[PDB]
Amino acid sequence: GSVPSLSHTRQWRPGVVQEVAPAGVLDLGPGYIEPALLPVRLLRGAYEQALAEYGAAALGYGHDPGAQPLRDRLAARAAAADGLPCDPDQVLLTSGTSQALYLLATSLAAPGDTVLTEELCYDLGQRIFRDCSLRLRQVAMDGSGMLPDALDRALTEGARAGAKTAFVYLTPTHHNPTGHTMPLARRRLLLEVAARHDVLIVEDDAYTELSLIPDRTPPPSLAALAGYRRVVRLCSFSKTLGPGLRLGWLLADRELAGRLATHGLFVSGGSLNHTTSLAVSTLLASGAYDRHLDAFRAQLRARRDALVGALRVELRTPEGGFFLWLRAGDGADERELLDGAARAGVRIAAGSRFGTTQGAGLRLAFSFNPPALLEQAAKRLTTAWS
Amino acid sequence: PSLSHTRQWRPGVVQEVAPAGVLDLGPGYIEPALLPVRLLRGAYEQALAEYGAAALGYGHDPGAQPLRDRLAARAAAADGLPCDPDQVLLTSGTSQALYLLATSLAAPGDTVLTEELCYDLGQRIFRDCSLRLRQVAMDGSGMLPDALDRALTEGARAGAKTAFVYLTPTHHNPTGHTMPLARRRLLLEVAARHDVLIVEDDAYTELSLIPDRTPPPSLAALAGYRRVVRLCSFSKTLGPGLRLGWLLADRELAGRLATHGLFVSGGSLNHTTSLAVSTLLASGAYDRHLDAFRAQLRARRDALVGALRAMLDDGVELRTPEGGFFLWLRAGDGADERELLDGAARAGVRIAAGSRFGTTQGAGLRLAFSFNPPALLEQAAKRLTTAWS
């Protein structure tokens, strides 16, 4: 482009990145950040600054729960977003929410235990839980997420059948795939149900910083609303700075965070991603992280609006995140709609990957392509579906 | 001005810092001044410029192909036996790899067999993953085959599943020994007959200090990668904070692990840093760094051994290790570990108690030479000698 940038695609190829769609396909499938938008040059400066500032400490074993400057700032950010306190001793760094989920699925759950999810939820997270030998059971949901009465019944009947529910897994903000955000009242009702049953909630909040309506912020987290009692919240830098960095964090009450941090995993290896955590820490410290979020939210808003505008079959416009959730209103089945996408040369994500739908649902990402290409994809899709 | 400064080498940043005034021969840490900070800075700079956006996207699940290719070639060259890239899986460090194996290839209650002395923090991972540890007798060459055979038989006759045998055959932590070829084969033969997995933790494999000497081939290679998983790391060669290592197995097991939801969800377990390190392998800078670092470690080993020679008499013994980070001092003869540790305290020196690593005959003490320059190792040894005498 016309401004200095390292965000080229010369190595955006199979064997380097996770997946590349077939040549000639306009790819609205994965919730990936458009390559040109990935902040490569910003991270280059961050590694340069972190290695200069932290010196040899950047390459030694890191403080087990994560370097304190990052714990301190991450706690302050959570508190500012929630309007509710969060102490640094509640923060544990991770090497990404994928690893965090593996950790919780094998440390706070045992093979055979049940995990309760919404009818629709993160498809790859389900695979982590299943591959860790956990049993998944879906709970009824509406446009605001999991239904308290259904969770209550599911937990009651599980207990009556003698089944151990290890935890309830929830993505309450900019839901993958529906885009919904659970409102405050529903958050409280679910917490009250889970508290009565004394069941842990795992709150996966990967899109929390990606509200697209400027000066609008999501409701407080389940974890904060519960005073961090029996809730673990998972956050990540994947959807804000780059998934390849393999860096995230975990918020819990002091006792649970401390218990987790004394696991041999941390005692042996130290901070789960020390060098990269220090790079990112310099971005939080300087204000560059928030400047980058302001730009990225604006980039996502432009893309969301282009795709929605070109598409305007039902769609609830999301307040944030990466995805639009299209619902057939006329009874068209998912296979026919996907066949239409194939005719259009457009890749989208089948709703059935995420669970049970009211009729056909389709997830379209706006995070991976510029507005003009999203409009082209929308035009080709609507021609094919016509 | 060296970038390997210690201005942030403080509690809350690094994992641990000994009390002020203590000469710290405890942890097997790399001396801060020797950590290749400038080298890694250039590696991040080059990787981000050359790989561009691909350095920050989700990485290829088993790890970026250039690293898979070169790590397989390095394994093959070291073993003198083939290794294909599809046998390599990148990890975020051996600690994470052990956690993965202890929860995916073992279930709560399963037994892991170890040597009487082995990695203390590795035992902690296994115990915290709800595994049962059972120790197997060892000698100067490592685990004894007859003892392993009896332990596996006893487990089978009791109905107790053995998930794997854990072994560090080269530059052993804490004894420093290197298992010779003949013992490697005898142990593989026992394990093969019982069909029990071996997890071969080889964190020090690149740290031979004799310039024209390489360790024997890995257990994994000797077994044709049948029922062995080998774990390697950049922690002891480039920097533990990088949180990058790799895993070698047969194609089937490597592929099976790599299809786990963990990898499908998160991609390569440490993508951006892996590409920085890849640029160092590709240029030869990694090997030139190893040449220089091995010479630094050799100087430290020789300084510490030389300054302890006055202690090595009448039952107090020290076998000089061919590589790695550690010396193992055996006192025996009714020597008391606590008394020896009290002497180290009087000397203002921190060492590692043998009982941290398991059962020893007599008293054993682990002393690291990796974290201090020769002059300070000599001063520490002099003070220890005075206190112990």
Side-chain angles (χ1 to χ4, degrees):
Chain A
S2 297
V3 296
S5 176
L6 296 177
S7 306
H8 65 75
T9 55
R10 294 192 291 271
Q11 295 295 330
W12 196 277
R13 56 182 189 81
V16 180
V17 296
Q18 177 170 58
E19 192 201 352
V20 187
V25 173
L26 276 50
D27 192 8
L28 280 62
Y32 290 172
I33 298 168
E34 184 185 329
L37 300 184
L38 282 165
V40 177
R41 201 162 165 276
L42 192 72
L43 264 294
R44 184 186 70 181
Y47 283 106
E48 293 173 341
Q49 182 177 346
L51 289 164
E53 170 177 15
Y54 288 97
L59 294 190
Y61 281 107
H63 185 49
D64 293 356
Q68 194 68 36
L70 199 49
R71 296 181 88 193
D72 288 352
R73 286 207 171 79
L74 289 173
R77 297 177 68 82
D82 292 323
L84 297 169
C86 184
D87 296 324
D89 61 15
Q90 299 182 243
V91 183
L92 180 59
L93 295 185
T94 69
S95 50
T97 288
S98 296
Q99 177 273 319
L101 289 169
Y102 188 86
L103 174 64
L104 302 179
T106 56
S107 189
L108 304 187
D113 291 350
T114 294
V115 171
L116 296 182
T117 73
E118 289 164 341
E119 299 188 77
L120 295 165
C121 77
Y122 185 27
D123 56 337
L124 311 182
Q126 294 174 228
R127 195 169 311 187
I128 298 173
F129 299 146
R130 291 188 270 103
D131 290 351
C132 293
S133 292
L134 307 181
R135 307 175 192 264
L136 297 178
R137 293 284 297 264
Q138 293 176 12
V139 182
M141 75 192 298
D142 62 4
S144 292
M146 187 177 289
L147 286 158
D149 287 359
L151 174 59
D152 203 2
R153 180 177 275 88
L155 290 167
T156 299
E157 289 297 324
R160 286 176 182 164
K164 178 65 168 193
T165 302
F167 48 81
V168 182
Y169 172 79
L170 291 173
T171 58
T173 297
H174 313 141
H175 184 274
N176 183 0
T178 70
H180 77 241
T181 294
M182 184 182 286
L184 172 63
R186 172 66 59 79
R187 294 177 189 246
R188 287 204 192 282
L189 290 171
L190 287 172
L191 288 170
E192 291 179 293
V193 169
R196 281 200 283 98
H197 289 275
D198 190 26
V199 60
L200 178 71
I201 289 167
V202 172
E203 177 180 28
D204 179 358
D205 218 348
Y207 304 87
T208 188
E209 302 194 80
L210 298 174
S211 178
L212 296 180
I213 309 149
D215 299 316
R216 174 257 183 196
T217 64
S221 69
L222 296 163
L225 289 170
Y228 293 89
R229 295 178 301 268
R230 299 295 279 153
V231 187
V232 179
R233 183 169 176 242
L234 305 179
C235 293
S236 179
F237 290 108
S238 289
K239 309 296 163 56
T240 58
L241 285 180
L245 294 170
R246 294 294 85 209
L247 184 67
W249 65 107
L250 174 158
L251 306 179
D253 73 7
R254 181 196 224 302
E255 187 280 343
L256 176 52
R259 266 218 302 110
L260 285 170
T262 59
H263 194 290
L265 170 63
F266 300 93
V267 177
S268 176
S271 165
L272 283 174
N273 193 343
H274 182 57
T275 306
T276 291
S277 81
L278 298 175
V280 171
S281 188
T282 70
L283 297 176
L284 275 67
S286 68
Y289 182 65
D290 287 307
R291 279 189 278 282
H292 168 67
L293 286 172
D294 287 340
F296 188 39
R297 289 186 281 243
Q299 294 153 10
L300 290 170
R301 193 186 174 194
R303 283 151 179 75
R304 182 200 65 172
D305 292 353
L307 181 55
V308 171
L311 290 166
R312 293 208 224 185
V313 175
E314 283 211 326
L315 169 58
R316 293 186 292 151
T317 296
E319 299 136 74
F322 283 2
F323 304 116
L324 303 184
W325 181 244
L326 293 185
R327 305 183 311 286
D330 65 353
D333 68 285
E334 184 179 78
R335 189 58 263 177
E336 179 190 344
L337 291 172
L338 294 169
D339 284 349
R343 294 196 302 278
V346 177
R347 176 161 80 167
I348 63 184
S352 55
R353 286 164 51 177
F354 307 95
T356 307
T357 57
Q358 317 286 348
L362 307 166
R363 192 192 74 181
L364 282 63
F366 51 77
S367 54
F368 195 49
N369 293 275
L373 275 181
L374 296 171
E375 295 172 337
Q376 285 180 34
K379 180 173 211 68
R380 295 187 198 170
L381 284 174
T382 52
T383 294
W385 291 338
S386 80
Chain B
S2 178
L3 287 170
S4 299
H5 67 76
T6 53
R7 298 197 295 275
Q8 291 297 323
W9 195 278
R10 61 180 184 87
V13 181
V14 296
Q15 176 169 54
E16 197 213 354
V17 185
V22 173
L23 296 171
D24 191 7
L25 282 61
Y29 288 171
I30 299 176
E31 179 184 331
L34 305 182
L35 283 167
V37 175
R38 185 174 290 280
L39 186 70
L40 268 294
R41 189 182 67 176
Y44 282 107
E45 291 174 339
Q46 177 183 340
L48 288 165
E50 288 179 2
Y51 286 97
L56 293 192
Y58 279 109
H60 186 47
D61 294 357
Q65 196 66 43
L67 205 46
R68 299 188 85 192
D69 289 350
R70 290 209 170 78
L71 292 171
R74 296 175 70 77
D79 296 319
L81 295 167
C83 185
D84 302 313
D86 62 13
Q87 300 182 243
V88 185
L89 176 54
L90 292 182
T91 73
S92 51
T94 291
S95 295
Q96 179 268 323
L98 291 168
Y99 185 91
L100 176 62
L101 299 182
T103 53
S104 177
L105 304 189
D110 289 355
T111 293
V112 172
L113 298 180
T114 76
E115 286 163 340
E116 300 179 284
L117 297 164
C118 75
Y119 184 29
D120 55 334
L121 311 182
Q123 300 169 223
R124 175 74 167 264
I125 297 176
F126 299 147
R127 294 199 178 95
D128 289 343
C129 294
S130 293
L131 304 185
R132 177 179 166 260
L133 297 181
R134 183 200 190 290
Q135 302 176 3
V136 180
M138 72 192 302
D139 65 3
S141 290
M143 191 176 287
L144 286 165
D146 289 357
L148 175 60
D149 188 30
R150 296 193 315 267
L152 290 162
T153 300
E154 289 171 4
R157 292 179 180 180
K161 174 68 94 191
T162 301
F164 46 83
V165 182
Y166 172 75
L167 291 171
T168 57
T170 299
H171 311 141
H172 181 272
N173 181 357
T175 70
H177 76 243
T178 294
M179 183 182 289
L181 173 62
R183 175 66 57 83
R184 289 177 194 245
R185 289 203 189 284
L186 290 175
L187 289 170
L188 289 174
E189 287 163 9
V190 172
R193 176 157 48 80
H194 291 270
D195 194 28
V196 63
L197 177 69
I198 293 169
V199 174
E200 171 179 32
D201 181 356
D202 220 351
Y204 304 89
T205 188
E206 298 194 272
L207 296 172
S208 299
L209 300 176
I210 298 138
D212 286 331
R213 176 252 187 200
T214 68
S218 69
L219 295 169
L222 289 168
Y225 293 90
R226 292 178 290 277
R227 305 292 283 131
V228 185
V229 179
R230 185 171 175 239
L231 304 180
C232 293
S233 179
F234 290 103
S235 291
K236 313 291 162 89
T237 61
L238 284 180
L242 296 168
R243 292 295 86 210
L244 185 69
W246 65 104
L247 169 159
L248 307 176
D250 68 16
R251 163 183 158 288
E252 187 279 329
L253 178 50
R256 179 157 71 77
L257 286 163
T259 67
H260 195 292
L262 167 61
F263 294 97
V264 177
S265 187
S268 173
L269 285 169
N270 189 347
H271 184 53
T272 306
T273 290
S274 78
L275 296 171
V277 173
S278 185
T279 70
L280 302 174
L281 274 55
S283 70
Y286 181 62
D287 285 309
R288 283 181 290 281
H289 166 70
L290 283 173
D291 288 343
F293 183 46
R294 290 185 281 238
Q296 293 156 357
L297 287 171
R298 177 169 203 278
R300 286 156 175 70
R301 182 199 70 176
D302 292 352
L304 187 56
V305 171
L308 289 171
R309 294 301 291 262
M311 291 294 306
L312 305 185
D313 203 354
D314 182 47
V316 182
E317 301 190 337
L318 168 48
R319 296 182 287 153
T320 296
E322 292 121 288
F325 282 3
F326 302 114
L327 304 180
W328 181 246
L329 189 58
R330 288 174 307 280
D333 288 356
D336 181 76
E337 184 182 80
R338 184 64 256 169
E339 179 177 9
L340 290 160
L341 295 173
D342 283 347
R346 290 196 303 277
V349 179
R350 178 160 78 168
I351 59 186
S355 59
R356 279 162 51 177
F357 309 94
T359 310
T360 183
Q361 204 219 335
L365 306 169
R366 192 193 73 182
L367 298 79
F369 51 81
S370 51
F371 193 51
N372 294 273
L376 283 190
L377 293 169
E378 287 174 339
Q379 184 183 178
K382 202 165 186 59
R383 294 187 192 177
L384 290 172
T385 297
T386 299
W388 286 335
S389 299

